[PDB]
């Protein structure tokens, strides 16, 4: 149950930044966000991993914080990962 409090809620400004940091992820690395999303959001498992629609409104804070922290491993630890 601590998982619900351990995860901090992602605000609008943040979900925006998130959608922008996800947009920074290269095709191979962004298949992970689709995967994190599809897996953590089994309600969108009908969606294909190469055709995913990251719905930041349906994405749980957990997924969003994961997506965000995930991209940061590729973005805030490496400049332009598609270069």
């Amino acid at each position: 149950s601590e998982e619900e409090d351990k995860c901090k809620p992602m605000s609008y400004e943040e979900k925006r930044q998130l959608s922008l940091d996800i947009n920074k992820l290269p095709g191979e690395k962004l298949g992970r966000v689709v995967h994190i999303i599809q897996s953590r959001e089994p309600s969108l498992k009908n969606s294909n991993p190469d055709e995913i629609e990251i719905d930041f409104e349906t994405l749980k804070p957990s997924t969003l914080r994961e997506l965000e922290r995930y991209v940061t491993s590729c973005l805030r630890k490496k400049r332009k990962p598609q270069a």
Partner: peptide
């Protein structure tokens, strides 16, 4: 509302 991210292959910028 944050716009739904359309990930239709090759969306990296």
């Amino acid at each position: 509302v944050v716009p739904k991210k359309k990930i239709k292959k090759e969306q990296v910028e």
